[PDB]
Amino acid sequence: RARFVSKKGNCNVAHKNIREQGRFLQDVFTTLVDLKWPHTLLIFTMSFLCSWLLFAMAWWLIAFAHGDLAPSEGTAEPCVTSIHSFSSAFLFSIEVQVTIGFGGRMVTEECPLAILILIVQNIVGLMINAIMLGCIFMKTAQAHRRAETLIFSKHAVIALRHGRLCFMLRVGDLRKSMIISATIHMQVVRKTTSPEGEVVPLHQVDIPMENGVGGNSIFLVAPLIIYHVIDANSPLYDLAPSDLHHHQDLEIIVILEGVVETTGITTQARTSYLADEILWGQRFVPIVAEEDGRYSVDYSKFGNTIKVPTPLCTARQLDEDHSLLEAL
Template sequence: MSSIRSPFGQDVEKQGIKLPKKWNDTNSKIPTDRTMAVGGGVAVGGGGVAVSGDSSEFPRKRRQRYVEKDGKCNVHHGNVRETYRYLTDIFTTLVDLKWRFNLLVFTLVYTTTWIFFGLIWWLIAYIRGDLEHTDDGEWTPCVANLNGFVSAFLFSIETETTIGYGYRVITEKCPEGIVLLLVQAILGSIVNAFMVGCMFVKISQPKKRAETLMFSQNAVISMRDNKLCLMFRVGDLRSSHIVEASIRAKLIRSKQTKEGEFIPLNQTDINVGFDTGDDRLFLVSPLIICHEFNESSPFWDISQEQLAREQFEIVVILEGMVEATGMTCQARSSYLDSEVLWGERFTPVLSLEEGFYEVDYDTFHQTYPTPTPTCSAHELAELAKKGEEIPLPPLTPPPIQNPNQNLDGERGRGEWDEEGEVESVSNGDVKKMDVQH
C-alpha cells in the first residue's frame, strides 16, 4: 500500500479496506461525529484534540476519505429494503452491472427466449401429431422437417434471429403457428433492441475518459495578487479535448449548528470562479484552479497554525463532454487537510519550443516554497486596513552541502545558489529572492 508523507507528519495511505454493508454489532459502529485519523501522536475525537508527547507511541492510521484520489466514493448503501426500485429502472440497473454479470444476463436472456419459444413450437407439433407423421409424405405439418425438441429449438433460433436457412419452414395449414410466429418476431425485436442498446451504452460509457484527466497530488496555499488563495492543478493527457469543461469544489467537514444539531460530512461550496466565469475551462494545457480567501470563503479565518489542527476534505469535480462521442464525462478527486501545503506554489510545466508549446508532466505535481504569511486572510485584511506591512516569514535554506541540490530532494521545489539565494520560478520568468538569514 502506497503512502504519501505530509508536512504535518501524517501518512496518507490509499485505502483498500471496504466497510461492511451491514453492522452486526451496534457497539462496533464508528460514529460519524469522530474522525478515524490518528497521526503523529494526535488523537482527535468529537470533543477536542489530545496531543501526546511521543508520536512514536501511537501507530499512524490513515484518514477515512469521502472520495478517493481516483474519484471513487467511499459510501456503501446498507439496509436498502425497497429493492423493487431497481427493477423499475431495469435498463440503468443492467448498465450499472459489472461486465461479467452484464454478459451473463445478455446470454441468459437470449438463451431463455430461444428455449421458451422452442418448447412452444415442439408442443404445437406434439399436439397436432406432427411428430408421429414425420415419415408420412401426405401429412402437412405445422413446421416442415420438425421432428423433435432439438429441431424445434433450432427453428426458434432461426425465427428470432431472422436467419432463415430454408430447411424448416412454417406451412399455411397451421394458424396457431402463424400467431406464434408473429409473437416471437415482435418479442424478439424488443429483446434485441433492449439488450443491444444496453450493451452499446455500457461500451460507450465515458468512464475511462476520466482516467486521462489528472489532478495534482496536493493543493497549495500561497499569495496571488496580494491575496491568500487555495490552488490545485488539473490537466488532460489526451489530444482530443473536453468540450464545455467546468470545475467545481466542495468542502466536506463536520458541522454543529447553533441549535446543537451535528451534521456529519456537511458540504460547502468553494468558489473557484463561478462569479467571474473562471470555472469554465479551456483545458488544452494544465491549468491552476484558484480559490480566493475572502469573506464568503470557508477558509477566511484559517491560519497556517490552525490548518494543522483542522480536519476536512476538499472534493473537486471536473465535468465536460467528450469531443469524440459527445457524452458527458466526470472526473473527481479529493484533498485531505494533510494534503494542503501552506506556502507552496506549483512548478511551471509549460515551455515554448520552436513552433509549439510543450507540457512537461514530470513536474505536474511538483511545488516549490514561496513567501507566504502564516496568519489568516481575515488578519491580512485587518492589517491592510491599518496600513501595516504584511509579515512574510523568511525562507531559510536547508542544511545541505550541494548548492544545486533540490530543496526536498525528489519534489524539486527550487535550487539554492552559492550566494544564499533561492531561485523562484514563476509562470513566465525566473526571479531571485533575497533570503534573510
C-alpha cells in the same frame, strides 16, 4: 477517518434505511446497460439462447402433440415440415427467430396453433432484438472513462499572490480532445455549529474560485492551477499552518463539470483534499515550456511542488498585520 470523497471521486457515503424502492424493471435495464463488457455480452448471448430453447421446446412439443414424430405415414401433413427431433425443432427455432429460414423446415397450414407460435416467436424476436440493440448502443455510445482522463494534483498548496493568501491546486486533461463548457466548483466541507446552537455534520459551503470574471468557466487545454483568493468572506479565512493535519476536521471538494466534445453528454470529475494533503507555503513547478514552435507540457512532475517562504499565520492575521504595517 471517513473521507467524504475519495481521491478518484468515489463518495464514501452510507445510505441506510431507504424506505421506498422497487419502481420497475427499467432500473435493472439501466443496470444492464451500465455494466462490464464481457458480462453484458454473456447476458445477451444467454438471452438469445434462452429464447431459442424456449421456442424450441415449444416447436418440438407441438410437433410431438400433432402425432407427427412417430407415424411417418405420408398421408398426413405436419405442423412444420421435416422436424424429427428436438434438435430439428431447435434448428427450426434458430432459423425462424434469426430470420434465416433455410427452407427444409417450413410451417404448413395444418396447425393453427403452429401459426400462433410463429406469430409469438416473431414478435418476441423483434422485441428482444430491439432491446439488445438499444442496450448495446446506449452502452457503446458511452465514454464512461472521460471522467478518468481528467486528473488533479495529489496535493494542494497555499501561497502568496498579489500579496493575498491563495489556495491552489493543479488540474489537467490527458486526452487531446477538448472539454466543452468546463466549469469548476470548489466546496469546503466540515462540521459547523450555528451561532444559534444547531450543528451540521457534513455542512458544505461553496468556496468561489478566482477568475477574471469571477464566474466558473475555465478553458482546460494545458494543465492549469485552480486557485481561490482567501478573502475575509472565505471559510478558510481562519485557517493556519500547524492546524492542518490528518486529524483535522476539514475537507475541500473540487468538482469539474463539462460537456464531452464529441458526445453531448456531460462528464463530471470529483476530487478531495483534506487537512493532510494540503501542503503549505509551496508553489507548483511550472511544467509548461516553449518548444520548437510548440508548448511542451511535461506531465511528469505534474503535481510536483516546491517550498517558498511564506508567513505562518492566518489570512485574518495577515490582514491585521498588514494594516498594522500600512497604518503609518
